[PDB]
Each structure stands twice: as structure tokens, then as C-alpha cells.
Design a protein around this ligand. Structure first.
Ligand code: FES
Ligand code: NA
Length: 113
């Protein structure tokens, strides 16, 4: 909502490509161009800690490079074994021809007694 991370020009991403987005002190994101639409998840495969931005898109499915598990990039839901834990999904907006991913940070929670 408030936090947006500038990735690159929309024209800098060919369809079927992934860009990794690093966040100082937080988990990296993967931004995917599927044809003419943009999606984002956590970059880190929930199964065995691989970088999904080093994988292969097959339409709207990201194939993990380590064990060939896979996720739907739109839903974050597992699409191939051995993946069982869904990815966090992040909103992506193109603003003035530039790709931004939501920082979906400001997750804030106090000590309960
Ligand atoms: S690390 Fe991704 S499928 Fe195992
Ligand atoms: Na495939």
C-alpha cells in the first residue's frame, strides 16, 4: 500500500523473464513478466532455499532450479512436487512505464503478556 520498490522499466523485461529484487534486511522477491502481465512472489523456494529468479517460467508457473518443484506466480500456490508450502504474493504496478513491487512490509506486532 505505502511501500513500493522500483524494479526496472517494463520494456527491460522480455515476456517469460524474472528479476530478483533485494530488500535491505528482508527476504528477496522475484518479479515475473508472463506475456504482458507482471506478478511477484518471495524469491526463496519454500522447499529447499533455491532462488526462483534462477528458474524457468512455463506460462504462469515458475519451475525451481534446485529440485524442479514449481509454483503458480499469480497465486503463489504449489504447482509441482516437492513444493507444499505456498509463496507470499506481492502486488506489482507499472507506473509511468516502470515496474514497482509492493514492499508488503510494515508488518508490525507487539510483545503479548
Ligand atoms: S529448493 Fe525448490 S523444489 Fe526444492
Ligand atoms: Na516445463
Amino acid at each position: 500500500n505505502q511501500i513500493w520498490l522500483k524494479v526496472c522499466a517494463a520494456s527491460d523485461m522480455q515476456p517469460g523473464t524474472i528479476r530478483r529484487v533485494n530488500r535491505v534486511g528482508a527476504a528477496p522477491l522475484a518479479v515475473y513478466r508472463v506475456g504482458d502481465q507482471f506478478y511477484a512472489t518471495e524469491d526463496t523456494c519454500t522447499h529447499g532455499i533455491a532462488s526462483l529468479s534462477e528458474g524457468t517460467l512455463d506460462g504462469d508457473v515458475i519451475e525451481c532450479p534446485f529440485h524442479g518443484g514449481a509454483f503458480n506466480v499469480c497465486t503463489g500456490m504449489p504447482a509441482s512436487s516437492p513444493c507444499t508450502v505456498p509463496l507470499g504474493v506481492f502486488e506489482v504496478e507499472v507506473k509511468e512505464g516502470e515496474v514497482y513491487v509492493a514492499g508488503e512490509k510494515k508488518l508490525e506486532h507487539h510483545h503479548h503478556h
